[PDB]
Homo-oligomer: A and B are copies of this chain.
Amino acid sequence: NGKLKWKFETGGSVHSSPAIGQDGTIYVGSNDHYLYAINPNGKLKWKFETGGSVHSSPAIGQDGTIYVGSNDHYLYAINPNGKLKWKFETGGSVHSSPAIGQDGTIYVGSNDHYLYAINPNGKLKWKFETGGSVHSSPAIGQDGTIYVGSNDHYLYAINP
């Protein structure tokens, strides 16, 4: 009906877009450098501290892993219990929101002008160099093509 259910106060602006897990958990980043996990009733499950503002929006893997980028140049992979799985350091701020492929590959852009393809274990698959910062979030076609925009005015289409 448009009536407020609840509101959860974070330490800074919430520009990240919330993701909903399989168990109804809500994951969202905040300007206060934290990735929040909130129960459906409005109470905090846990919060993970990164080095910088978390403007990227979280993605949830098939195994429940939460993937999100941060202003500290890292792409974070966090287990549903709030413990860190691995973190991949890029060359610039990761404001792009990660996308997960059919084989589990994590795609995300970074301020370092690169689009990163990362294995689920945390190892680099490949990185494509664009002309400018990649703040757009990648999309994956049915054939596996990765589409993402870049600051160099181009929308890219890249093989798996």
Contact = CB atoms under 8 A, between A and B. Distances in A.
A10 interface: yes
Interface string A38-60: 10101000000000000001000
Given A18-B148, A128-B4, A153 B9 contact: yes
Interface stretch (A19-27, A62-70, A71-79): A19-27
Contacts of A30: 149, 153, 155
Given A13-B150, A26-B141, A28-B155, 7 more contacts: A4-B158, A14-B154, A15-B135, A18-B149, A20-B147, A28-B149, A57-B137
20 contacts: A2-B125, A2-B127, A3-B158, A5-B145, A5-B159, A7-B156, A8-B154, A8-B155, A8-B157, A9-B154, A12-B153, A13-B153, A14-B151, A18-B148, A19-B139, A20-B141, A20-B147, A24-B141, A24-B142, A30-B149
